[PDB]
Amino acid sequence: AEFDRITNFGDALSDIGNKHMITVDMNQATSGKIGIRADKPNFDGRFSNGPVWTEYLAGFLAKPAPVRGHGEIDSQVVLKDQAGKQITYHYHHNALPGTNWAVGGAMSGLGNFLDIDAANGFTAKSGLDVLTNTGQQIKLRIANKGQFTGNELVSYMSGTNNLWFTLFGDLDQTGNKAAGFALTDIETLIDAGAKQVLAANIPDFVDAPWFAGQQKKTTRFIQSHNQALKAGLDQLAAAHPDVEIYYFDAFDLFNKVSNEVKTKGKYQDKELAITLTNVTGEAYSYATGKVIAQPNRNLFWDGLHPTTAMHKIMAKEAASLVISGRTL
C-alpha cells in the first residue's frame, strides 16, 4: 500500500461528532444555557441517522476508523437572560489530537465561525464562534500533530457552508470565490507534506429541501464552485507530480443517483444492500422531531445532510477512486 491512516477535513458531510460534542461540553459547562447541535434523533452527533462517508471510507479501505480531532478552544462566552442581565463563562477545552478534524457548519478558508445557539431563555452576545473553518482545522492539525509524513490519505470536502451562509447569512461569495478558499486550503495540505489527497466537490444539492425556492442560486454557485475547484486541482496536480490527487466527483454521484430514482423509480446497489426510492424528501423533520419508517430509502436525512445509506454510496465511489489509482 502507501497509507496506513486517513485524516479528514471539512463539514457535517465528514464530521463524526465535533460540532455535537463541543455543544454538549459547552451545555454541561453552562448548566444548559447552550443548545446541543445534532441531538437525537441524529446518530451519536453525526448530522445523519448513522455513520457518515468518512466512517464507511475507513471500512472500505481497511484503515483505522476516524477519531475526532480539534484544536484548543479558549473563549469568553457572553450571554444575556431575557432581563438583559449579562453572564460570562471562560470556556476552555484542550486540543484533541485525533484524525477527523471535520466540523459541522465549517466553510472553506481560515478563521472561526458562529453556528451555536444559546438555550433556555438566554441569548448569546459574543464568544460562541468557537467552531473552526476547514482551513483553520488544517492549521490546528499541523500545529498539534506536525507535518504529514506522506503515509496518510487526506480527505478534503468543503464548500457546502460557503453556499449555506451566502443564502442564509451575510457571507456573500460566488462559487468560484468559495473554490479559491478550498484551493488555498488544499495547497496548505500539499505544502504541509500531504502526498495523497482525496478532494471532493460540492454534491448536487438542487433538491435539498432546505434550498427550496433557492434552486437557481444553489445551481449557479455549486457549478461555478465545482468548475473552479476542478481547474485548480488540475493545476495543483501539475505543480506537484509527487502528490496523488483523487477528484471525488460527489456532484456527478448525487446527480446519477437522483436521475436513476426520478427516471427508473429506484437506485439499487446490491453489494451495499441499499435501494433508494426517494431523492426529494426529508427522512427527518427538524421542527417536529418526527422520522419516517425507513429513512434508508432516502438520499436526504434532514433538509440537506445525506442518510447513512447515501453516505455508504458516497464512500464506495471514493474508495473505488483510491483503489483504482485514478489520480489527476
Number of domains: 1
Give the helix proportion (percent range). Answer: 25-40%
- Gap from first CA to last CA: 19 Å
SS-based class? alpha/beta
The strands making up the biggest β-sheet line up spatially as: 1-7-8-9
Gross morphology: globular
Gyration radius, rounded: 19 Å
Range of strand content: 15-25%
- Give the SSE order as H and E letters: EHHEEEEEHEHHEHEHEEH
**What is the tally of beta strands?**
11
Helix run count: 8
**Biggest beta-sheet profile:** 4 strands, parallel
PDB class: hydrolase
Keywords: Hydrolase, GDSL esterase
Assembly: monomeric
Entry title: Crystal Structure of mutant GDSL Esterase of Photobacterium sp. J15
What would you note in describing this structure?
Helix content is 35%, strand content 16%. By secondary structure, the chain is of the alpha/beta class. The chain has one domain. The strands form 4 sheets. It has a 4-stranded parallel sheet, sandwiched between helices. Strand 2 (73-80) and strand 3 form a beta hairpin. The longest helix has 25 residues, at 215-239. The chain is globular. It starts with a strand and ends with a helix.
Write the layout of secondary structure elements.
Blueprint: E1 5-10, H1 18-29, H2 53-61, E2 73-80, E3 86-93, E4 112-113, E5 123-126, E6 131-132, H3 134-145, E7 152-157, H4 160-168, H5 175-191, E8 196-200, H6 215-239, E9 244-248, H7 250-264, E10 267-269, E11 274-276, H8 308-324
Parallel strand pairs: 1-7, 7-8, 8-9
Antiparallel strand pairs: 2-3, 2-5, 4-6, 10-11
Helix pairs in contact: 2-8, 3-5, 5-6
